[PDB]
């Protein structure tokens, strides 16, 4: 079938260089035009440009001029992007795509993050019920994630257990750190004679935690 | 550049409804135009080609129809899963370029959310900071004010708001919200709060707790 695979996450310098991968397989590479689309947070999507792998040919959006440069290697089937001169505004996922009018194969994009900041592992902690509006049926226990770099970390509870009444809210940035909350809800009748556990993992910094909601008897 | 506007914005819709999504281009671009859609977080997936045609796979559900400067696509029966990002693109000429987005949202039955409050942790704390975290869960609308208050007294500096996509399962939201402060800054108050208004209720949900009570 035609694939169309793009190379991993990237966290990027200001300043810096980026070279984005597309691999293509399945069909003659040489033939199609490769197509570059960058999607920054909600904002609509941006024709980059493209290019012909078999000739060398290559059209740039003019607003793209001298930032995208667009090669290929014909032998191992692979286009590339080039960003040059990274800002925090190049900060986006791109998408490599099969030239054809329409596009009906799209690489499952690439995400790039500029910043100066760097791997910190993350605060993971624990909030247990006030005092005071615990009491109910159910109970809503929270994990608080905080100051991590970069994206992601990875929040389960009881170790995949609970799966049932868990959300995870999308990071925020707060001071060029990432903050996150998770919370899950459970019958008053597992917490707190239940052990419920946090799970943290964030494989930037090769942590892991496991942070248990201890009731606030303290 | 041909300019592809796409109306409305935001779609609320209750599945069953047939809706009709339109994308005008700033000049003719002929019948070089195909619509896309994006779930959260996933490549695009093209459902028309040329105006109208059809590719394998895509529900029967979806057609285009159009031609030079008005484009639609019509889904009859908006079904659960038909939520996300409908875009157009041109084809026409160089660059090539794409619509602003039509977001769909399914409609669903009003839903309170339910406020929860928690005091800033002691191990966060020691280190000197003070997070305080409002979940505001399974809500819709989408609308909703949150408002935090410390001695009675509101404060607007130092929330950071996150919400989660519309739910796949229930179609509700989620929401929370957090308060940092200094621990110093903290500790030179008693009553903090978390007070939501939403549209199922007159009166707000308010949450509160007492920074000493144990």
């Known amino acids: 079938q035609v694939q169309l695979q793009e190379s991993g996450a990237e966290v990027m310098k200001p300043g810096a260089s980026v070279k984005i991968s597309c691999k293509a397989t399945?069909?003659?590479?040489?033939?199609?035009?490769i197509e570059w689309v960058k999607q920054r947070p909600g904002h609509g999507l941006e024709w980059i440009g493209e290019?012909?792998?078999?000739?060398?040919?290559?059209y740039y959006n003019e607003k793209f001029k001298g930032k995208a440069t667009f090669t290929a290697d014909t032998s191992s089937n692979t286009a590339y992007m080039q960003l040059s001169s990274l800002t925090s505004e190049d900060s986006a996922v791109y998408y490599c795509?099969?030239?054809?009018?329409?596009?009906?194969?799209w690489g499952q994009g690439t995400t790039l993050t500029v910043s100066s900041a760097s791997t910190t592992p993350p605060s993971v902690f624990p909030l247990a019920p006030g005092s005071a509006a615990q009491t109910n049926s159910m109970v809503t226990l929270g994990c608080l994630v905080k100051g991590y770099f970069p994206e992601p970390v990875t929040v389960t509870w009881n170790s995949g257990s609970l799966s049932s009444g868990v959300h995870t809210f999308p990071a925020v940035l707060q001071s060029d750190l990432y903050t996150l909350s998770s919370s899950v809800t459970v019958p008053s009748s597992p917490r707190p004679s239940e052990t419920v556990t946090c799970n943290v993992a964030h494989p930037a910094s090769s942590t892991k935690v496991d942070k248990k909601i201890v009731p606030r008897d303290c | 550049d041909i300019e592809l506007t796409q109306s409305p914005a935001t779609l609320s819709v209750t599945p069953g409804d047939s809706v009709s999504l339109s994308c005008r281009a700033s000049?003719?671009?002929?019948?070089?135009l195909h619509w896309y859609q994006q779930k959260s977080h996933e490549s695009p997936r093209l459902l028309i080609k040329?105006?109208?045609q059809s590719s394998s796979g895509i529900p029967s559900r979806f057609s285009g129809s159009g031609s030079g400067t008005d484009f639609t696509l019509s889904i009859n029966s908006v079904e659960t899963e038909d939520f996300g990002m409908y875009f157009c693109?041109?084809?026409?000429?160089?660059?090539?370029?794409f619509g602003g987005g039509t977001k769909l949202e399914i409609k669903r039955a009003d839903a309170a959310p339910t406020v929860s409050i928690f005091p800033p942790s002691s191990e966060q704390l020691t280190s000197g900071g003070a997070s305080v975290v409002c979940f505001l869960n399974n809500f819709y609308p989408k609308d909703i004010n949150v408002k935090w208050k410390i001695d009675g007294s509101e404060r607007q500096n130092g929330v950071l708001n996150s919400w989660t996509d519309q739910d796949s399962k229930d179609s509700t939201y989620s929401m929370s919200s957090t308060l940092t402060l200094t621990k110093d800054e903290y500790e030179r108050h008693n009553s903090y709060t978390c007070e939501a208004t939403h549209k199922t209720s007159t009166s707000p949900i308010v949450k509160s707790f007492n920074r000493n009570e144990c």
């Open positions: 040329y105006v109208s």
């Open positions: 290019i012909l792998p078999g000739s060398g040919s290559t």
């Open positions: 693109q041109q084809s026409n000429s160089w660059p090539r370029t």
């Open positions: 399945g069909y003659t590479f040489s033939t199609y035009w």
């Open positions: 000049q003719s671009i002929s019948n070089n």
């Open positions: 795509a099969r030239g054809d009018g329409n596009y009906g194969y």
